[PDB]
Design an enzyme around this catalytic site. Structure first.
Site, PDB file in Angstrom:
ATOM      1  N   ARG A 229      -3.852  -5.215   1.299  1.00  0.00           N
ATOM      2  CA  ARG A 229      -5.516  -3.807   0.441  1.00  0.00           C
ATOM      3  C   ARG A 229      -6.304  -3.669  -0.623  1.00  0.00           C
ATOM      4  O   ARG A 229      -5.306  -5.022  -1.483  1.00  0.00           O
ATOM      5  CB  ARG A 229      -5.869  -2.850   1.616  1.00  0.00           C
ATOM      6  CG  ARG A 229      -5.608  -2.545   2.552  1.00  0.00           C
ATOM      7  CD  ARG A 229      -6.121  -1.013   3.711  1.00  0.00           C
ATOM      8  NE  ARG A 229      -6.542  -1.587   5.571  1.00  0.00           N
ATOM      9  CZ  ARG A 229      -6.237  -1.507   6.053  1.00  0.00           C
ATOM     10  NH1 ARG A 229      -5.372   0.044   5.346  1.00  0.00           N
ATOM     11  NH2 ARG A 229      -5.901  -0.654   6.912  1.00  0.00           N
TER      12      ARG A 229
ATOM     13  N   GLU B  33       0.779  -1.051  -0.060  1.00  0.00           N
ATOM     14  CA  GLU B  33       0.027   0.421  -0.356  1.00  0.00           C
ATOM     15  C   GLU B  33       0.635   1.190  -0.483  1.00  0.00           C
ATOM     16  O   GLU B  33       1.890   1.087   1.074  1.00  0.00           O
ATOM     17  CB  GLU B  33      -0.828   0.308   0.766  1.00  0.00           C
ATOM     18  CG  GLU B  33      -1.990   1.330   1.499  1.00  0.00           C
ATOM     19  CD  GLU B  33      -2.454   1.121   2.440  1.00  0.00           C
ATOM     20  OE1 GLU B  33      -3.948  -0.078   2.682  1.00  0.00           O
ATOM     21  OE2 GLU B  33      -2.090   0.426   4.020  1.00  0.00           O
TER      22      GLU B  33
HETATM   23  N1  LIG Z   1      -8.948   3.806   1.604  1.00  0.00           N
HETATM   24  C1  LIG Z   1      -8.421   4.044   3.095  1.00  0.00           C
HETATM   25  N2  LIG Z   1      -8.093   5.424   3.857  1.00  0.00           N
HETATM   26  C2  LIG Z   1      -7.495   5.430   4.607  1.00  0.00           C
HETATM   27  O1  LIG Z   1      -8.137   6.605   5.736  1.00  0.00           O
HETATM   28  N3  LIG Z   1      -6.426   4.918   5.080  1.00  0.00           N
HETATM   29  C3  LIG Z   1      -5.687   4.855   6.201  1.00  0.00           C
HETATM   30  C4  LIG Z   1      -5.328   4.318   7.052  1.00  0.00           C
HETATM   31  C5  LIG Z   1      -4.122   4.316   7.501  1.00  0.00           C
HETATM   32  O2  LIG Z   1      -4.177   5.521   8.629  1.00  0.00           O
HETATM   33  C6  LIG Z   1      -3.650   4.800   6.178  1.00  0.00           C
HETATM   34  C7  LIG Z   1      -2.731   3.003   5.433  1.00  0.00           C
HETATM   35  O3  LIG Z   1      -3.415   2.540   5.662  1.00  0.00           O
HETATM   36  O4  LIG Z   1      -3.821   5.124   5.096  1.00  0.00           O
HETATM   37  C8  LIG Z   1      -5.725   3.268   4.377  1.00  0.00           C
HETATM   38  C9  LIG Z   1      -7.046   3.326   3.324  1.00  0.00           C
HETATM   39  F1  LIG Z   1      -6.712   2.553   2.033  1.00  0.00           F
HETATM   40 MG   LIG Z   2       1.007  -0.987   5.959  1.00  0.00          MG
END
Ligand SMILES: Nc1nc(=O)n([C@H]2C[C@H](O)[C@@H](CO)O2)cc1F
Ligand SMILES: [Mg+2]
Ligand SMILES: Nc1ncnc2c1ncn2[C@@H]1O[C@H](COP(=O)(O)OP(=O)(O)O)[C@@H](O)[C@H]1O
Length: 229
Positions: free
Chosen positions: A97, A34
């Site tokens: 994810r 990610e």
């Molecule tokens: N669609 C998403 N929205 C988010 O707000 N996060 C946030 C969650 C975490 O704080 C950071 C890293 O994943 O990003 C991750 C996502 F995939």
């Molecule tokens: Mg991570």
């Protein structure tokens, strides 16, 4: 062709920890991480920290964040499909994810919390539907690995990792994200606009314990799980 497996879980459940042990288990396994460091310093393919902006003022920055978050994911996942290195007796691509958590966990939660209004929410879903229409078949999942951990474990792991932006996140927010994952992946009662996901195999790994002690059993279960796909 390429088997596609996404790894799902709450913030700080242990996805990068898990992702970092996978390549050493089979040389045919690839990983799309990610792009969170890219969300913290926005630049074209130093700049704005869009993750921080959302968390500081979520009613202002959630739509913008969620839209950029998902597109950058799609770009990254697509890049590794056509990304040459595939040719292997058994290629497996792990996604950290997916476009489905982006929408059904994260964006949905912020809408439901009044951080996106009806207009923003309608535009996001419209965009997300269209994006899936174009690049949907490419990215379809053969399986999900759910990294299950209590919201309280996650809260603590946020502390351990020490990423500046996430230090202010309340337990309440993590609990909401917990229950959405349980609904989608445990009870399988969360309905989506993508029917195949309802029968996609799911592996649930309880990761509340110490990674060192649980590592060997988790490896066994991942190999066992992949062989049934
Ligand atoms: N669609 C998403 N929205 C988010 O707000 N996060 C946030 C969650 C975490 O704080 C950071 C890293 O994943 O990003 C991750 C996502 F995939
Ligand atoms: Mg991570
Ligand atoms: N099973 C575990 N046991 C002990 N510490 C862990 C475990 N999983 C993750 N951690 C720690 O928790 C923090 C967050 O892990 P990380 O992999 O960054 O989570 P995610 O990638 O899901 O956001 C890091 O400090 C990492 O060292």
């Amino acid at each position: 062709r390429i088997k596609k497996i996404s790894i799902e879980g709450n913030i700080a459940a242990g996805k990068s920890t898990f992702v970092n042990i996978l390549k050493q288990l089979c040389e045919d396994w690839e990983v799309v991480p990610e792009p969170v460091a890219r969300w913290c310093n926005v630049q074209s393919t130093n700049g704005g920290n869009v993750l921080q902006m959302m968390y500081e003022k979520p009613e202002r920055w959630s739509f913008t964040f969620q839209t950029y978050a998902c597109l950058s994911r799609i770009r990254a996942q697509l890049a590794s499909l056509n990304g040459k290195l595939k040719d292997a007796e058994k290629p497996v691509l792990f996604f950290e994810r997916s476009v489905y958590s982006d929408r059904y966990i994260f964006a949905s939660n912020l809408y439901e919390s009044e951080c996106m209004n009806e207009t923003e929410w309608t535009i996001y879903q419209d965009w997300h539907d269209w994006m899936n229409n174009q690049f949907g078949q490419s990215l379809e999942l053969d399986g999900i690995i759910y990294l299950q951990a209590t919201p309280e474990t996650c809260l603590h792991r946020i502390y351990l990792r020490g990423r500046n932006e996430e230090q202010g996140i309340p337990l309440e927010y993590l609990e909401k994200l917990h229950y959405k994952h349980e609904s989608w992946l445990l009870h399988r009662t969360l309905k989506t606009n993508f029917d195949y996901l309802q029968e996609v195999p799911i592996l649930t790994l309880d990761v509340n314990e110490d990674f060192k002690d649980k590592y060997e059993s988790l490896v066994e279960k991942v190999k066992e799980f992949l062989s049934t796909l």
